[PDB]
């Protein structure tokens, strides 16, 4: 399947080259906030990111080998997790601030316009500060983000038995993360510890996603693009 024949270095470069672009917001700073406008910007930003994420998912090793029903499920499961880890990643060098876009940098203060957002904001900030303390690398980040895509929805899927295929790709990415840490001059003890620390973060990105999702399908404050509605409704049942 080629994805299994990939070396660690080949895995890294493939994930890096497949990275989506950073999109700009439709934010005019001369006109202050309404709950609707804020959600307007965020929903309008996420929906375009979704289009890129889908094409990004195609370039993730081993992802095309899956049936398209399985591809649909994995993305339906993980889309907010991936949006959030991306958000957290580009917000690393901006303490106390979330970099939704190069022109949209917000603190938790204006995170209070929307009800229930400040809770999610704080968690995103904590995660970002965690990535900052760990000196998380781009190569490590694209591995993690790739791990979220295939892992988040495996146990929510009749002799399919290519959940095994997903699992071996996951193992290969694990090998990749270890390879990277070995190159950074980390001892075996340090490698296993850092590996663990990184994967435990995923538990909290899952938590943030679910808490966020729960607030997202509560609405009517700004209407949602038909794709962002379908991704959202995939969780509402």
């Amino acid at each position: 399947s080629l994805a299994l024949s990939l070396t660690a270095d080949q895995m890294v470069s493939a994930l890096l080259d497949a990275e989506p672009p950073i999109l700009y917001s439709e934010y005019d700073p001369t006109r202050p906030f309404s709950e609707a406008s804020m959600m307007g910007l965020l929903t309008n930003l996420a929906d375009r990111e979704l289009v890129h994420m889908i094409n990004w998912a195609k370039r993730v090793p081993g992802f095309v080998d899956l049936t398209l029903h399985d591809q649909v499920h994995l993305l339906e499961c993980a889309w907010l997790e991936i949006l959030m880890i991306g958000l957290v990643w580009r917000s690393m060098e901006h303490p106390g601030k979330l970099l939704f876009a190069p022109n949209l940098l917000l603190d938790r203060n204006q995170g209070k316009c929307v009800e229930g957002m400040v809770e999610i904001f704080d968690m995103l900030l904590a995660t970002s500060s965690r990535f900052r303390m760990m000196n998380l690398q781009g190569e490590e980040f694209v591995c993690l983000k790739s791990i979220i895509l295939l892992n988040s929805g495996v146990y929510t899927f009749k002799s399919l038995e290519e959940k095994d295929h997903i699992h071996r790709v996951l193992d290969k990415i694990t090998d990749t993360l270890i390879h990277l840490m070995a190159k950074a001059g980390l001892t075996l003890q340090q490698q296993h510890q850092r590996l663990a620390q990184l994967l435990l973060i995923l538990s909290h990105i899952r938590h943030m996603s679910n808490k966020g999702m729960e607030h997202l399908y509560s609405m009517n404050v700004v209407p949602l693009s038909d794709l962002l509605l379908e991704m959202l409704d995939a969780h509402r049942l």
Binding site: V51, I54, L68, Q71, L75, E230
Partner: peptide
């Protein structure tokens, strides 16, 4: 034809 399905199908 979920929008997601079509976009993945292209």
């Amino acid at each position: 034809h979920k929008i997601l399905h079509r976009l993945l199908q292209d």
